[PDB]
Design a protein around this ligand. Structure first.
Ligand SMILES: *[B@@]1([O])O[C]([C]C([O])=O)[C][C][C]1[N]C(=O)[C]C1=[C][C]=[C]S1
Length: 270
């Protein structure tokens, strides 16, 4: 009834990109949605790290002091693209600091350390099942989860399930109130997304996001909660892939798809 009330040229955008774009956007006030390839699977890439941090926050509700726990690690724990954890190799970091690094810098070593805390990819998947997400699956660790192989369901979800779970965690009741605001605050402090959904969002609106870039198969993504002033928040997810291993990802295409999603919802923006 309220899905795709206004058609938007997503097909032309993905054809110009040379791949596939998946979009799901939800106006949490009216329930209206924009949906394009929204139930297809796309690789999560580093976007799983947002849900990883939420799963850590959920575990901290039953294990008080978890966030403050100092974690030491060896050089063998470093993974290419660990921009924060490499600076604390000789000191260690807290669980909360690792979580913030995973969310805000996509830190790979931090992500693997936190996955170990949860019992691995199946532990994160179990958390997602516990909030009602039956689509999400994490199967591997960094960096193997970035292979983005066409047709491979490992380490994928759908734009719709990403958006639905993001809404539950940032705006609904999946986390207790203090943990919910901490998750929002980590997303708001993200540093990796300035050229993606944020580039479609006016500077005077609040926004938290989590990006991912697999590095192959034109595969990259971003999901976000956006608070336009004077109306209810919008939750959205934009995922891309492409058929050839050497196909380039495009941040501009992600920003453009986000613009179309906001336009389709009737949200006056840029
Ligand atoms: B992850 O999938 O994405 C991060 C970048 C982001 O958030 O958009 C970087 C770490 C992960 N990616 C990889 O390890 C492979 C890389 C692709 C580009 C730079 S590192």
């Amino acid at each position: 009834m309220l899905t795709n009330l206004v058609a938007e040229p997503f097909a032309k955008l993905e054809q110009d990109f040379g791949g596939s774009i998946g979009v799901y956007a939800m106006d949490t006030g009216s329930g209206a949605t924009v949906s394009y390839r929204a139930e297809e699977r796309f690789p999560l890439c580093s976007s799983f790290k947002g849900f990883l941090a939420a799963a850590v926050l959920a575990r901290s509700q039953q294990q008080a002091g978890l966030l403050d726990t100092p974690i030491r690690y060896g050089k063998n724990a470093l993974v290419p693209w660990s921009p924060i954890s490499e600076k604390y190799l000789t000191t260690g970091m807290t669980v909360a600091e690792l979580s913030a690094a995973a969310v805000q810098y996509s830190d790979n070593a931090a992500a693997n350390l936190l996955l170990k805390e949860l019992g691995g990819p199946a532990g994160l998947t179990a958390f997602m099942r516990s909030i009602g997400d039956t689509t999400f699956r994490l199967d591997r660790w960094e960096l193997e989860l970035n292979s983005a192989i066409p047709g491979d369901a490992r380490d994928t979800s759908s734009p719709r399930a990403v958006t639905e779970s993001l809404q539950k965690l940032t705006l609904g009741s999946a986390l207790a109130a203090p943990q919910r605001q901490q998750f929002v605050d980590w997303l708001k402090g993200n540093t990796t997304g300035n050229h993606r959904i944020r580039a479609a969002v006016p500077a005077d609106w609040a926004v938290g996001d989590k990006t991912g870039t697999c590095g192959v198969y034109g595969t990259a993504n971003d999901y976000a909660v956006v608070w336009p002033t004077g109306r209810a928040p919008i939750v959205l997810a934009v995922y891309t892939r492409a058929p050839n291993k050497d196909d380039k990802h495009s941040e501009a295409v992600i920003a453009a798809a986000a613009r179309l999603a906001l336009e389709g919802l009737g949200v006056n923006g840029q």
